[PDB]
Write a protein that binds this ligand. Structure first.
Ligand SMILES: Nc1ncnc2c1ncn2[C@@H]1O[C@H](COP(=O)(O)OP(=O)(O)OP(O)(O)=S)[C@@H](O)[C@H]1O
Ligand SMILES: Nc1ncnc2c1ncn2[C@@H]1O[C@H](COP(=O)(O)OP(=O)(O)OP(O)(O)=S)[C@@H](O)[C@H]1O
Ligand SMILES: Nc1ncnc2c1ncn2[C@@H]1O[C@H](COP(=O)(O)OP(=O)(O)OP(O)(O)=S)[C@@H](O)[C@H]1O
Ligand SMILES: Nc1ncnc2c1ncn2[C@@H]1O[C@H](COP(=O)(O)OP(=O)(O)OP(O)(O)=S)[C@@H](O)[C@H]1O
Ligand SMILES: Nc1ncnc2c1ncn2[C@@H]1O[C@H](COP(=O)(O)OP(=O)(O)O)[C@@H](O)[C@H]1O
Ligand SMILES: [Mg+2]
Ligand SMILES: [Mg+2]
Ligand SMILES: [Mg+2]
Ligand SMILES: [Mg+2]
Lengths: 314, 328, 338, 477, 322
């Protein structure tokens, strides 16, 4: 077998779907070649690493194997590496087209020690005539302030719904899969922006149950069913909600964190109730979540959360 | 001092705490003692019981040979559990001489007593899981915690649970009478039970309060029985007369009078916020208020105590509590 | 000025004869001195009592002390330092400069001082800013070393101290000086400083307006003597510090005008007050008591004021950005008063 | 080799000492110290000439990142015609390696400086050394014994030794306490940076709105390299400043709109879209929402809830979101709490007090106030470290009580006694170990009716000169 | 000699109970030979470790000591460990190995985000020469990438039939008699963790083995577990709902003192009891749940015990007024 996320990974910059502004920025960068040092920040699985990889590929053409140094969390990045190997790579003579430059792609820059990030400063400041640096990070706060200021910051928003839907439809058309609209909406729901997780859940559903259907997705996700949680959060009499939470969710060994997270996610999408009541229900569920994370996970906390949600809905 | 010179070295001297310990008394002669987690209020006997058990089981030879006493004074990071705790959970048994087996049967396992595990990080507790599962046959673990909700549940599923009831406010008066008569201290009639109640939860606090009261009374050369006032003045609890003044002021009074009185109190009176406890006791044990009043009183007192728990200001919370209790 | 009239012995004390008698009693046992926990309002002179007790036990040379700096490495790779003022017989640890590393420094320093071998004294200032982990480490240190480290800790409102620590130490309190005794000390000061008083009513007036805080009373007497040319008459416009006047002007602006157009300037004044080394809790307490002092409000408004003040004081003690909670409290106050 | 393919920061680097924008005073101080270092060496570094800058061997540069410290140091060393022997973080500056490499060259001469030009009478310092230790703060864990060895290098040296760091008051930088002179580079003002950006823009044949330039200079928090690097992005025009550069402003503009939270608009813009709008920038959105949530004319008010109640509930939710953010930053592994924070600090107050913007969206100011509070707390901590020997108080009660009367005793004589009270003033200053800088710091911490920045300059400058020249003769410790 | 927790540990796939839905799947995976990376997650005391060790011993037989590497949580777990040990074990190919190795990471939810990123990159790199198996208690503290990379397996708690079968097998192989209500109270208090059951069984064995014939009554089980008996809960609730303030306070105090009861478990039992009452109104239930949750949250921080007890009594009383 073969993972779809690995098989259908975009190799050309145009195939990347998502942020429309920064992808066009990188398109013009590859068209010109004068790429500056850049940090790329954003939430996981929204197309950070693939973006910089495609950029380097399209920018260097046939010389990618000789003019690119990649360093992820697997490779050793301490003090000796940044002082010896990176410095000897930056000085390496290489005759490229007039606009191109050697590229150093540092993925998961957050794991790089601050003391290790110190050494990179003069190494990237001095040899900026034949070497450019591209950091890829989740949180741009763990990068030291000097490196934070030396390079251009590129933020990647979380994926919307129409973009993930378009990508999934492309994948289905290329793979000739049987599906339905409710299944795709369930994929969008369980993904919430993670293109990688969306594609993986799609492939797992197709491999396990063949047909992309709501019950199949909700049986392969191992998460509480969104319909039953919505019924819990929308029952008229409180005892019905308490009985639902007791018998249908608490007995089957679900983790309280998962229950609160699913309630949060379904309350976000309840497009039938008003907006203010949604915000207040989210506030209550979030207070209950903060209580849960502090060490107490008794059923009484979820019962009180449901009670307060009903008190608000009345 | 007195708190340590009359410390019980055997599990028989203790009389208030005899429920949880007994099972160990049944299994002391065997080598299959399960991993134990003591929990409860401080100053209960946990340290006393573990040291008495080590004295009755090991002896002076092996008291410090295969026992590792770790406290919050020692380094509580992952460094210790990696370097020394893991090394000591594996080390072999040491038998230096023959004067130990005469009075104490030595088991082939060992005991490590990791105290104050309440404030331990989750990663350190996951490491404790490994170091307890890998040497469960040759090494036994003793844990101490004041709050069970902080220590993670997978550990409590492995280690057996033991609670030490705070204190017995009925029979310990005889123990304190014995201590007083052997110390030849002349106290009043109704002071011993008062010393015990004001020191609720702890007994070490009780004996140290008795010691302080005696050492303060014997300075005057008065030769009279030390009354409850001298004890309540050293325990930090609020006197009863100023408490009656407070409750009369809050029973009938406007905002300005209450404000001025609490200003005077927080300025020159007893600077503690333990007056909430005294107010709760007085309002609960009283029989002159209806139920709908006592319900709101208990709720308001609980709210004020929960707010004071977070280390906030004393004056503002006390004034708010008294104003809200005056609104009824 | 004030430090020029600071007692240097228990006999030189001129206040709380009960307390000095009890300390003379306790100083009769230099070989066995239990741990002491002094608690009482600010400016009562607890540090004076402690240093006088030290001078009574040790030599009078305990007052000539030298400052020192000590830097150490933590479990991680951070090497941080603190400043301890030490004497030939005692040392004063003030775990306030460091934010969260209290436990490591207290553990290391106490364990290092407890291996010098007749004992040594460790004075812990601001014993309420100690994290519970640091407090537990201190209690275990007390449990281990008891023949070289006799702890004396001064603090105020000793609620954030766990009962495991209260049990071992002797609880001593220092009540604020009554207005009569404050007036007596002020009279002694103006006598030894030959200040031309027109009457003795100014002393009682200062004692009343000082709220039982001895040191601020002495210091405001100092501040007023340099504005009347050492001739204090009956017409004395009592001088308040700058921040108190700013807080009172803020209170008057809150009472007189109730709108967001004034809430903007209120936030500006809060920013200006905070950025000049002023805590949040002090601002909140002063603003609350000032708003309660105003005579135009009824009892319901005052009850709402004190309730919101309590809630936002808890939230200030739980949060980290004080401007948010202060602006929220003032907004709720303006809402209720509207 | 190409004029274009170089970055915009290296291509537009300063060349002289009149293009360095901001901090002219510190540059002139460094230049006048380096020029007179020769005569200071002649006098064995014991005669402090007219500035107290004749006894120090090493100069130390510090300040926020992106101001020109490295550029100023290099240009100052080059103008005098010296030879720059530079070592930085990328070199292993251990104790043994420093003793081997640099220590043997503290007093030697240069070969390249000799052979470059030695025949024409330009300047006699063409062959001397100027050792620049850049990023001394960057001494990581792999450089053992570096800070102490450099502190020892400060003394016993024979050539100008410039040092550069980013945080002077860091404990690791303590061994440089009094053994070297230290000047400070502040964040440049908006006028000089605006002039430099205008020069660059007209030089690159493109114009921008001055308001956009002001917003940029505000966002970058004074960093010049950062704003230049962000401006270089214009070539790759409202889309540029709308999407990439001025993103938090547009986030605040979209969130505070009144048409979104309406029933007609909410059906087109879901709540998930607003949470994504927050997630766009989760570092500046809470502060931006808190700064200007009370400067809009609302339109979503309830029938019976005025503006004040709405702003009060918004501030309550802001406080709750602040508590949630603190709980999050207590342990990063709880990033799952990030969406909840999203609704508390960001979405809820905006939805509560949405409407139409009255004026213009003002950038957040909490960062500058936090920096000012940190600086003043450092200064007060130093003052207490000095004065603790004779005050018997805590670091916070000092500012509360003692500072007003201290300011009175230290200044008010200068208002009524004229200038003969200096012998008394220093007397008080001799009792509390204070210095002239301590006097300035004490004079600084005052707000309200007792503002001193206006009053300080009213006294005659002759009194200041006399006080300074009289304090120089005595020393208390 | 060794404890029952270590003795009765299963050694084959047949000796696991109440997990057939996963056992058939792992048997399909072992007969197919296409065993991918696995994630086993669930509540403690369920059989994840036992199942994976039995599966490894079945697949590799005697080569288990060579091709199976077990790693636990925070074994000096910097990025350096994942860079050296796991990476060498994955990359290095044995001399006479056919197939792939197995690296089992026990309690691997205590890894930092950087450590989990290193692990996901490693598993991505050498996914052709070895397969991994990650064990977890909470599947919400793992990076979604590592979760998506492998196949999930949730371990639902042990049902009543499985635990009853296991305690029967333990009973027939030991010298103990068990009363009818004993197993009922056992299953009610254990909540479905086999480890706690095997611990408490040997505990009460060593506790009441005086004549080698005593019967384990519910008293000794409630003592060894440290849990209250439902009769005391009903009695204290009755006293609170019927008597006055002083008598109810004294009753609560004596019940929580003479037996050693924590307010947390007492509140759990009280709300469990109140869950099945026929309350006529609704506001009572809402106020009750809210106030009781607040009491539990406040107890979680260790306030003043008597104050929280009086607050519990006041909430229960003031809730039942309609
Ligand atoms: N916009 C996109 N279009 C198509 N595929 C995408 C997109 N974004 C993510 N993916 C898929 O997600 C997979 C995961 O790779 P990346 O997105 O590069 O991971 P990442 O963004 O670096 O997140 P990390 O590594 O956890 S910080 C890729 O192999 C793609 O198949
Ligand atoms: N049940 C008891 N009977 C007699 N003396 C006791 C008892 N409990 C405590 N003591 C006395 O108190 C001291 C022992 O108390 P500890 O065992 O330290 O209490 P503790 O609960 O272990 O406190 P911790 O756990 O360190 S917070 C000795 O001086 C004993 O004499
Ligand atoms: N005053 C200035 N005017 C114009 N450009 C400046 C100025 N200061 C810095 N720069 C720019 O910044 C580049 C050099 O950066 P520096 O500010 O010298 O670095 P730095 O001051 O050492 O700060 P670090 O190294 O990050 S701590 C120059 O080439 C310019 O592009
Ligand atoms: N399904 C089961 N069938 C039979 N015995 C079991 C079962 N689950 C657990 N046990 C017994 O309980 C012991 C503990 O099992 P473990 O596999 O260690 O539990 P676990 O799944 O690893 O949960 P942890 O380690 O606390 S996260 C085993 O050695 C068995 O004796
Ligand atoms: N008995 C006394 N006689 C004269 N002055 C006193 C007496 N007690 C206290 N003081 C004065 O009170 C001032 C403040 O006391 P201090 O211990 O500094 O308060 P804090 O505990 O707030 O630091 C001291 O400067 C001292 O001069
Ligand atoms: Mg990546
Ligand atoms: Mg103990
Ligand atoms: Mg630099
Ligand atoms: Mg396991």
């Amino acid at each position: 077998q073969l993972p779809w996320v690995e098989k259908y990974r975009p190799q050309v910059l145009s195939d990347i779907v998502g942020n429309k502004e920064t992808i066009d920025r990188l398109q013009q960068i590859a068209k010109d070649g004068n790429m500056p040092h850049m940090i790329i920040s954003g939430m996981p699985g929204i197309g950070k690493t693939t973006s910089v990889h495609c950029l380097a590929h399209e920018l260097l053409g046939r010389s990618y194997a000789d003019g690119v140094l990649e360093l992820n969390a697997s490779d050793d990045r301490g003090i000796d590496v940044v002082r010896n190997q990176i410095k000897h790579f930056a000085q390496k003579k290489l005759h490229l087209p007039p606009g191109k430059h050697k590229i150093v792609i540092l993925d998961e820059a957050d794991s790089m020690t601050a003391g290790a990030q110190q050494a990179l400063r003069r190494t990237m400041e001095l040899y900026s005539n034949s070497t450019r640096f591209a950091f890829a990070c989740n949180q741009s706060n763990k990068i030291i302030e000097p490196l934070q200021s030396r390079c251009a910051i590129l933020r990647y928003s979380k994926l919307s719904d129409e973009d993930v839907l378009k990508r999934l439809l492309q994948i289905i058309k290329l793979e000739d899969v049987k599906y339905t609209n409710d299944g795709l909406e369930a994929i969008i729901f369980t993904a919430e922006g993670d293109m990688r997780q969306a594609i993986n859940n799609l492939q797992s559903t197709v491999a396990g149950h063949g047909l992309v259907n709501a019950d199949n997705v909700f049986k392969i996700v191992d998460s509480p069913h969104p319909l039953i949680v919505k019924k819990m959060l929308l029952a008229s009499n409180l005892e019905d909600s308490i009985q639902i939470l007791r018998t249908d969710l608490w007995k089957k060994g679900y983790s309280s964190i998962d229950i609160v997270t699913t309630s949060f996610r379904v309350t976000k999408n309840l497009a039938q109730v008003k907006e203010s009541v949604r915000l207040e229900m989210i506030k209550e569920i979030g207070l209950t979540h903060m209580r849960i994370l502090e060490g107490v996970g008794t059923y009484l906390q979820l019962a009180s959360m449901l009670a307060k949600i009903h008190k608000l809905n009345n | 001092p007195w708190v340590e010179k009359y410390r019980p070295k055997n599990l028989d001297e203790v009389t208030a705490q005899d429920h949880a310990v007994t099972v160990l008394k049944k299994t002391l002669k065997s080598a299959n003692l399960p991993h134990m987690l003591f929990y409860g209020p401080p100053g209960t006997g946990k340290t006393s019981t573990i040291l008495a058990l080590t004295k009755e089981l090991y002896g002076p030879d092996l008291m410090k040979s295969r026992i590792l006493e770790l406290n919050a004074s020692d380094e509580r990071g992952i460094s210790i559990v990696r370097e020394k705790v893991k090394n000591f959970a594996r080390l072999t048994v040491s038998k230096p001489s023959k004067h130990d087996l005469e009075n104490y049967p030595c088991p082939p396992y060992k005991i490590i007593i990791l105290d104050e595990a309440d404030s331990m990080t989750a990663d350190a507790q996951s490491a404790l899981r490994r170091t307890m599962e890998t040497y469960s046959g040759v090494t036994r673990f003793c844990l101490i915690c004041n709050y069970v909700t902080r220590i993670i549940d997978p550990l409590a599923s492995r280690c057996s649970k033991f609670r030490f009831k705070a204190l017995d406010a009925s029979n310990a008066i005889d123990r304190l009478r014995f201590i007083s008569e052997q110390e030849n201290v002349k106290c009043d009639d109704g002071v011993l039970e008062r010393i015990l109640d004001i020191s609720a939860g702890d007994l070490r606090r009780g004996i140290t309060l008795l010691q302080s009261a005696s050492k303060g009374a014997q300075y005057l050369g008065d030769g009279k029985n030390i009354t409850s006032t001298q004890v309540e003045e050293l325990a930090g609890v609020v006197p009863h007369d100023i408490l009656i003044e407070i409750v009369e002021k809050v029973k009938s009074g406007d905002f300005d009078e209450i404000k001025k009185y609490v200003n005077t109190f927080m300025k020159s009176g007893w600077s503690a916020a333990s007056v909430v406890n005294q107010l709760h006791e007085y309002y609960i044990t009283n029989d002159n208020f209806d139920t709908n009043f006592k319900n709101q009183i208990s709720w308001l007192l609980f709210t004020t105590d929960s707010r004071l728990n977070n280390g906030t200001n004393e004056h503002i919370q006390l004034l708010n509590l008294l104003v809200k209790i005056s609104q009824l | 000025w004030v430090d020029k009239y600071r007692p240097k012995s228990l006999n030189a004390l001129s206040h709380n004869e009960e307390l000095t008698n009890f300390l003379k009693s306790l100083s009769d046992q230099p070989r066995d001195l239990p741990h002491l926990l002094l608690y009482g309002p600010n400016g009562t002179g607890k540090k004076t009592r402690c240093m006088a007790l030290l001078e009574s036990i040790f030599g009078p040379g305990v007052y000539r002390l030298k400052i020192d700096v000590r830097q150490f490495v933590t479990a991680s790779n951070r090497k941080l330092e603190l400043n301890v003022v030490s004497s030939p017989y005692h040392l004063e640890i003030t775990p306030s400069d460091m934010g969260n590393n209290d436990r490591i420094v207290i553990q290391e320093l106490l364990k290092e001082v407890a291996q010098m071998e007749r004992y040594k004294c460790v004075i812990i200032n601001e014993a309420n800013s100690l994290t519970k982990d640091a407090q537990a480490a201190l209690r275990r240190t007390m449990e281990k070393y008891s023949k070289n480290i006799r702890l004396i800790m001064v603090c105020d409102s000793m609620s954030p101290i766990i009962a495991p620590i209260k049990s071992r130490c002797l609880l001593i309190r220092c009540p604020a000086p009554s207005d009569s005794e404050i007036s007596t000390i002020l009279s002694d000061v103006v006598t030894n400083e030959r200040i031309q008083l027109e009457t003795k009513d100014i002393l009682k007036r200062i004692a009343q307006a000082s709220n039982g805080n001895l040191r601020v009373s002495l210091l405001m007497l100092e501040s007023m003597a340099l504005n009347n040319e050492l001739a204090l008459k009956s017409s004395s416009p009592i001088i308040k510090p700058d921040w108190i006047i700013v807080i009172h002007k803020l209170t008057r602006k809150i009472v007189k005008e109730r709108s967001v157009n004034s809430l903007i300037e209120c936030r500006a004044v809060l920013y200006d007050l905070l950025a000049h080394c002023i805590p949040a809790n002090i601002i909140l307490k002063e603003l609350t008591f000032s708003l309660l002092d105003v005579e135009t409000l009824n009892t319901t408004n005052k009850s709402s004021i004190i309730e919101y003040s309590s809630v936002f004081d808890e939230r200030l003690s739980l949060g980290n950005k004080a401007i948010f909670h202060l602006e929220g409290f003032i907004a709720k106050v303006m809402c209720c008063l509207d | 080799v190409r004029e274009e393919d170089k970055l915009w920061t290296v291509k537009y680097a300063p060349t002289n000492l009149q293009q360095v924008c901001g901090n002219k005073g510190s540059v002139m101080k460094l230049k006048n110290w380096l020029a007179n270092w020769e005569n200071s060496k002649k006098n064995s570094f014991k005669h402090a000439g007219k500035d107290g800058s004749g006894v120090f061997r090493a100069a130390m540069l510090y300040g926020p990142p992106g101001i020109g410290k490295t550029t100023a140091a290099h240009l100052v060393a080059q103008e005098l015609g010296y030879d720059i022997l530079e070592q930085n973080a990328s070199d292993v500056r251990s104790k043994t390696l420093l003793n081997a490499g640099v220590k043997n060259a503290l007093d030697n001469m240069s070969v390249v400086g000799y052979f470059k030009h030695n025949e024409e009478a330009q300047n006699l310092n063409g062959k001397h050394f100027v050792i620049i230790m850049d990023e001394v703060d960057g001494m990581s864990g792999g450089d053992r014994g570096g800070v102490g060895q450099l502190a020892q290098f400060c003394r016993k040296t024979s050539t100008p030794l410039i040092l550069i760091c980013n945080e002077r008051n860091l404990p690791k930088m303590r061994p440089f306490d009094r053994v070297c002179l230290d000047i400070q580079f502040r964040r440049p003002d908006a006028n000089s940076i605006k002039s430099r950006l205008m020069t660059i823009a007209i030089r690159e044949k493109f114009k921008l709105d001055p308001n956009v330039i002001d917003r940029l200079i505000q966002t970058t928090r004074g960093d010049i390299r950062q704003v230049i690097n962000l401006l270089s992005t214009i070539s790759t025009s409202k889309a540029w400043e709308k999407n990439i550069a001025l993103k938090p402003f547009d986030i605040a503009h979209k969130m505070l709109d009144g048409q979104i939270y309406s029933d007609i608009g909410s059906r087109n813009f879901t709540l998930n879209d607003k949470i994504a709008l927050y997630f766009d920038d989760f570092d500046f959105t809470p502060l931006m929402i808190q700064e200007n949530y009370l400067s809009t004319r609302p339109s979503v008010l309830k029938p019976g809830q005025s503006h004040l109640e709405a702003v009060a509930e918004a501030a309550n939710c802001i406080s709750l979101g602040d508590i949630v953010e603190k709980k999050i930053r207590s342990s990063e592994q709880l990033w799952s709490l990030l969406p909840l924070h999203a609704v508390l600090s960001s979405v809820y107050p905006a939805s509560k007090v949405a409407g139409h913007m009255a004026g213009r969206i003002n950038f957040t100011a909490w960062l500058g106030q936090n920096s000012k509070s940190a600086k003043y707390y450092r200064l007060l901590q130093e003052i207490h470290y000095h004065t603790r020997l004779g005050t018997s108080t805590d670091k916070i009660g000092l500012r509360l009580d003692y500072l007003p009367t201290f300011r009175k005793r230290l200044l008010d004589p200068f208002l009524k006694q004229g200038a003969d009270a200096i012998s008394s003033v220093i007397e008080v200053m001799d009792d509390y170990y204070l210095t002239k800088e301590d006097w300035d710091s004490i004079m600084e911490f005052f707000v309200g009716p007792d503002v001193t920045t206006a009053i300080i300059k009213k006294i005659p400058a002759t009194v200041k000169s006399g006080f300074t020249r009289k304090y120089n003769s005595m020393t208390h410790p | 000699n060794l404890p029952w927790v270590e003795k009765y540990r299963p050694e084959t796939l047949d000796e696991v109970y109440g997990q057939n839905e996963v056992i058939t799947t792992v048997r399909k995976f072992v007969d197919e030979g296409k065993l991918p990376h696995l994630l086993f997650y669930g509540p403690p005391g369920t059989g994840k470790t036992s199942t994976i060790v039995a599966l490894a011993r079945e697949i590799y037989g005697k080569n288990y000591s060579n091709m199976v590497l077990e790693l636990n949580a925070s074994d000096d777990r910097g990025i350096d460990v994942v860079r050296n040990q796991i990476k060498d074990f994955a990359s290095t190919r044995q001399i006479f190995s056919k197939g792939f190795k197995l690296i089992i990471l026990d309690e691997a939810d205590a890894m930092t985000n950087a450590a989990q990123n290193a692990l996901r990159r490693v598993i991505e790199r050498y996914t052709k020469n070895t397969r991994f198996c990650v064990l977890a208690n909470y599947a919400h503290k793992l990076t979604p990438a590592l979760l998506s990379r492998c196949t999930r397996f949730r371990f639902q708690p042990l049902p009543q039939e499985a635990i009853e079968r296991r305690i029967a097998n333990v009973l027939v192989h030991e010298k103990l008699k068990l009363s009818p209500n004993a197993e009922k109270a056992l299953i009610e208090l254990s909540n479905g963790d086999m480890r706690r059951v095997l611990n408490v069984l040997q505990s009460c064995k060593a506790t009441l083995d005086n004549p080698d014939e005593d019967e384990i009554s519910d008293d000794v089980i409630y003592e060894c577990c440290g849990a209250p008996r439902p009769s005391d809960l009903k009695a204290v609730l009755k006293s609170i709902l019927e008597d006055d303030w002083g008598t109810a306070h004294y009753t609560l105090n004596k019940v929580r003192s003479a037996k050693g009861l924590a307010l947390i478990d007492l509140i759990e039992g009280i709300v469990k009891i109140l869950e099945d009452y026929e309350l006529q109104n609704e506001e009572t239930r809402v106020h009750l749940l809210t106030k009781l949750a607040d009491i539990e949250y406040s107890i979680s921080k260790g306030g003043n015990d008597q104050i929280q007890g009086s607050a519990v009594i006041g909430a229960i009383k003031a809730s039942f007024e309609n």
